[PDB]
Amino acid sequence: GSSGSSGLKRDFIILGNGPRLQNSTYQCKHCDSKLQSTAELTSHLNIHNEEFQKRAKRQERRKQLLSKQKYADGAFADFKQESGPSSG
Ligand SMILES: [Zn+2]
């Protein structure tokens, strides 16, 4: 109280591709991050749980898109990914 000043305003920055290449990195399936190894994932994940506990509010719209997936039958008893053509 008994004051009158301000100073709260900043910006963010997101950029960094580089020709670098992935190296034994862990591509999380929750935030799409990159960890060194499980040792880090085991902990990193835990974060999600906590973040979900709070984030889990009385939201209104709750839905999730689907991920179509194809497969081959093959006459001869066999099953292989045989990833189809890259639609693009
Ligand atoms: Zn994650």
From Swiss-Prot:
It is found in: Nucleus. Transmembrane segments: none annotated. There is a cross-link at residue 80 (Glycyl lysine isopeptide (Lys-Gly) (interchain with G-Cter in SUMO2)). It is linked to Weiss-Kruszka syndrome: An autosomal dominant, multiple congenital anomaly syndrome with variable expressivity and complete penetrance. Patients manifest developmental delay, hypotonia, feeding difficulties, craniofacial abnormalities including ptosis, abnormal head shape, downslanting palpebral fissures, metopic ridging, and craniosynostosis. Variable congenital heart defects can be observed in some patients. A few patients show agenesis of the corpus callosum on brain imaging. O-GlcNAcylated with O-GlcNAc-6-phosphate. The gene is ZNF462. This is Zinc finger protein 462. Zinc finger nuclear factor involved in transcription by regulating chromatin structure and organization. Involved in the pluripotency and differentiation of embryonic stem cells by regulating SOX2, POU5F1/OCT4, and NANOG. By binding PBX1, prevents the heterodimerization of PBX1 and HOXA9 and their binding to DNA. Regulates neuronal development and neural cell differentiation. The chain holds residues 1874 to 1948 of 2506 of the full protein. It comes from Homo sapiens. Interacts with PBX1; this interaction prevents PBX1-HOXA9 heterodimer from forming and binding to DNA. A zinc finger (C2H2-type) spans 26-48.
